[PDB]
Design a protein around this ligand. Sequence first.
Ligand SMILES: Cc1n[nH]c(=O)nc1Nc1ccc(C(C)C)cc1
Ligand SMILES: [Cl-]
Ligand SMILES: [Cl-]
Ligand SMILES: [Cl-]
Ligand SMILES: [Cl-]
Ligand SMILES: [Mg+2]
Length: 346
Amino acid sequence: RPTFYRQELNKTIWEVPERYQNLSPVGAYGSVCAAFDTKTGHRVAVKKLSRPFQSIIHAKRTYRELRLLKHMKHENVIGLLDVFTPARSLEEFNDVYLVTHLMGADLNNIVKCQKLTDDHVQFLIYQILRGLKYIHSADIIHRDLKPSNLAVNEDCELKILDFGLARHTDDEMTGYVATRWYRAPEIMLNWMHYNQTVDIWSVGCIMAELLTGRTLFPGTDHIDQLKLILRLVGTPGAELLKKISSESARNYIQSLAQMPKMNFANVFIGANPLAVDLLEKMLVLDSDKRITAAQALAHAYFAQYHDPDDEPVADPYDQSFESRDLLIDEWKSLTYDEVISFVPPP
Ligand SMILES: Cc1n[nH]c(=O)nc1Nc1ccc(C(C)C)cc1
Ligand SMILES: [Cl-]
Ligand SMILES: [Cl-]
Ligand SMILES: [Cl-]
Ligand SMILES: [Cl-]
Ligand SMILES: [Mg+2]
């Protein structure tokens, strides 16, 4: 066990190992401090979870986040540098701290403030798809891909962060909000179950924005956004309509005048024809027909970065706990076990 020291920063007590120095507050899930890690020499983000075991839903969400972060070991995905508690036994266990690499800019900071060449777009989207190939190979769905969840450094290197933990609420998705602008239309009103093709829709929305500098579907509400989407990609054809099982979806959809898919070369004026072709393969209304991450890596648009010997897959990830029903103390004890079994990376 390391030695811990205590301090109060903005009305919160932080009790952390001596290896973490120069804590500075940075920003409902918890409070975050930037710090210097004297073991690894990295600047890190230290998050103290708020009330991690207050309810069954909260205790299970704490376990979910910790299991997910412990699993991710990929250059283009946020990983777990450390996890700790000041408790010396399960019986006094109450607080959980998570440590990750500190992130400077996100893709928002860059999209708003840079002139991006086609070469910049190629490299940024290539890295998203390389990380997504890894995530999807473990049968994980991110669910919340958007520019503020992509970290980028001065060398244009990118990491995916902030996995959807089933945390976003109804009010968080209401109105003119970036929280919803990147979500696939078949899940915006829960007409279909979540599946990994929804992440590819989000990548298409991000790629379009990098190309034009503008949000692709900046809807003022769920319905306005659906209208923007259907104008670009068309209303459902007969083949897709056969597959639509939600009666709610069918009733409303059939009230809309039919529209053809638009010509993407007239929407994304001046873009590389290969980037237009890839966008057409991501932004397909029928999610069965969307390109996958593994398929997209072999698209000609990435010819200068694609290396099939350096695009690795993940160890299998056991998610059986998601269908399990336990008490608070049992979720809490499973979380304690994962804290004390953590082994740092090399
Ligand atoms: C592919 C698919 N499979 N099953 C289903 O129930 N619904 C599906 N797609 C679907 C596509 C679009 C829409 C709205 C956005 C027009 C709804 C369902
Ligand atoms: Cl220490
Ligand atoms: Cl504690
Ligand atoms: Cl965002
Ligand atoms: Cl596992
Ligand atoms: Mg975020």
